């Protein structure tokens, strides 16, 4: 609240300093931001404690950055951490005390939890609460009565209005409890699903699962994990532990296919007990319990097919023990978020790898599903070898003179097709691919602009893939890339970042970018994170290039596009010039060649 002569807020008169400050490696700002030391001998103990109560926002190598909020604190109580259980240790760990504002905030957040509990039974949602006083003063707003369908006091609530009420209670200072007591539940018989000994659970995976299962009752929340970290395995394990009906929801045809393979590979459950509620193909969804479906079909808004209609009615009627939603970052979408209310589930676990977006709808994920249970440390995984180390880089490609003139001259937005297609980046990518091609490194180019992607591919006569590409040709190209030594590069369009199972690649060039989308960058980055059989963290075998054009709008997006990655700890190095580019022969080595491309670019319209 107090501002120094500079921008920083003043806290000299706010909180004191512990005499043994050096022993205590923890800081506590009044705003809730916390700065831990990654060099302290007791760093690990602090890391576990802070992660339990706070959600990371920046975890560079030396000094991590944690901020706590109401959602973060509620999760701590769910795992059994009381206000004194956390504040006492926080004061002990704090090297500068705890400001009263945080103290009262912690007290208010912890006490305002568990008073209101939401339980669904017999397809009816009852807002149970041991304390009756909470309900008495909770019915002041008229929305509650109209929302409601027309000790331990409970009342049934309308199915459709659950989401509206859930967000209302969050700002009402009375969060709802979504814990599932699968251990004590006889209404829905347990499913015959078991985890085979073959599956191996990594220490972070166990910790993420442990945080989800704070007590005998499973907690509904979001577990963010890298795609190469094996987030699919964790989802399977959670379903196996619940031992009740689970409805995994994908986002595309590829997503549903992989999940079924993951279930069979890691779960002993029989093949016949798994169904694919997919329009393209089905396996008698009503017949068995464990099902894999997609947001589009379940949330499909237009006319429903007769066969789908029966399945949809069957899904609505039944009650699901678990509702795994992979790629939760798309949930707050209008159609996608409707699926939450359409189906009934006790705890709706959420998995993903890039929990970031521009529109401030990510915060809704806290109430749409639950608090962010776990968010693995990408840097720590790199040290442990679970994830391939990446030498993130940003190759600056100076714009050719003529190209800039039209780019600056025109105030229209043809520039997206212009600065994405310039000779220097073309030579840069052409040179960059050539260097990696002779190094036996697998390349995965990317480009939002299909027009640029096709032009780059034909000139480099490489197997470019994109949306309307035939499925058969899509598989044929991938198989050659994985197997054929003669080919070690595939030019994938945006479809690559959506969902796929691609072979591990040593490098990932990105000539163009869709825009300032932290999702796409992290989505595309996860492709090379696939750990190799016998690599090492320090070898930096995996690389990532995000080619950009200097003095162009592309730079603004690139800096705005790397915010999420740097927060994890990745350092994006800049490369003004590439050694050996001049000696190596490359296309567009003469003014005429650039002129024809510019004319074609201008003729694009």
């Amino acid at each position: 609240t107090k501002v120094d002569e500079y921008g920083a807020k003043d806290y000299r008169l706010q909180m004191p300093l512990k005499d043994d400050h050096t022993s205590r490696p923890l800081w506590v700002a009044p705003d809730g931001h916390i700065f831990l030391e990654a060099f302290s001998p007791v760093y690990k103990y602090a890391q576990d404690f802070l992660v339990a109560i706070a959600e990371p926002v920046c975890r560079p190598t030396h000094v991590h950055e944690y901020k706590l909020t109401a959602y973060s604190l509620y999760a701590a109580v769910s795992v059994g951490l009381q206000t004194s259980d956390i504040t006492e240790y926080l004061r002990k760990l704090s090297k500068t005390g705890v400001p009263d504002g945080i103290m009262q905030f912690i007290k208010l957040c912890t006490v305002s939890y568990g008073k209101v509990k939401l339980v669904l039974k017999h397809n009816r949602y009852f807002v149970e609460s041991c304390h009756p006083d909470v309900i008495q003063h909770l019915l002041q707003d008229p929305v509650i009565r109209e929302c409601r369908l027309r000790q331990t006091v409970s009342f049934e609530v309308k199915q459709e209005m659950i989401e509206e009420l859930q967000k209302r209670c969050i700002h009402l200072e009375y969060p709802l409890l979504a814990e599932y007591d699968f251990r004590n539940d006889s209404v829905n018989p347990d499913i015959n699903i078991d985890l085979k000994p073959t599956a191996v659970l990594r220490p972070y995976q166990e910790k993420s699962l442990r945080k989800m299962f704070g007590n005998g009752r499973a907690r509904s929340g979001v577990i963010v994990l890298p795609c190469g970290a094996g987030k699919s395995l964790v989802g399977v394990t959670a379903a196996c532990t619940v031992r009740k009906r689970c409805l995994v929801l994908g986002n595309s045809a590829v997503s549903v296919e992989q999940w079924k393979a993951q279930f069979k590979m890691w779960s002993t459950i029989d093949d016949s007990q798994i169904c694919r509620f997919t329009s393209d193909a089905k396996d008698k969804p009503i017949g068995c319990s464990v099902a894999i479906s997609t947001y589009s079909m379940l949330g499909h808004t237009t006319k429903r097919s007769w066969e789908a209609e029966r399945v949809m009615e069957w899904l609505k009627t039944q009650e699901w023990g678990l509702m795994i939603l992979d790629e939760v970052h798309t949930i707050p979408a209008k159609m996608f978020r409707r699926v939450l209310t359409i189906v009934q589930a006790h705890c709706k676990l959420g998995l993903t790898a890039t929990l970031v977006r521009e529109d401030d709808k990510i915060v809704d994920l806290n109430f749409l599903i639950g608090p962010k249970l776990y968010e693995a440390n990408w840097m720590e995984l790199q040290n442990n070898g679970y994830i391939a180390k990446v030498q993130c880089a940003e190759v600056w490609c100076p714009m050719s003179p003529e190209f800039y003139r039209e780019y600056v001259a025109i105030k229209t937005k043809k520039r997206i097709l212009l600065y994405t297609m310039n000779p220097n980046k073309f030579r840069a990518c052409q040179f960059l691919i050539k260097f990696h091609e002779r190094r036996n490194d697998k390349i995965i180019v990317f480009a939002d602009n299909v027009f640029a992607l096709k032009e780059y591919a034909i000139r480099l006569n490489k197997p470019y893939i994109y949306g309307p590409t035939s499925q058969g040709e899509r598989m044929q190209i991938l198989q050659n890339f994985k197997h054929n030594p003669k080919i070690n590069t595939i030019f994938i369009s945006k479809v690559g970042d959506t969902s796929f199972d691609l072979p591990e690649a040593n490098v990932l060039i990105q000539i163009s970018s869709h825009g300032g989308s932290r999702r796409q960058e992290a989505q595309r980055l996860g492709r090379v994170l696939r750990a190799k059989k016998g690599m090492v963290a320090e070898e930096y075998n995996a690389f990532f290039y995000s080619l950009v054009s200097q003095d162009t709008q592309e730079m603004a997006y690139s800096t705005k596009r790397q915010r999420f990655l740097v927060d994890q700890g990745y350092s994006f190095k800049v490369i003004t010039k590439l050694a050996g580019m001049e000696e190596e022969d490359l296309a567009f080595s003469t003014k005429e060649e650039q002129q024809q491309l510019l004319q074609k670019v201008l003729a694009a319209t």
């Binding site: 795992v79 910790k207 299962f213």
Partner: peptide
């Protein structure tokens, strides 16, 4: 037959005392 996760949170920081 329950799993280790159902037992409870590890509480790694409880070991240290001051």
């Amino acid at each position: 037959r329950t799993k280790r996760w159902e037992g409870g949170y590890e509480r790694t920081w409880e070991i240290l005392k001051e």
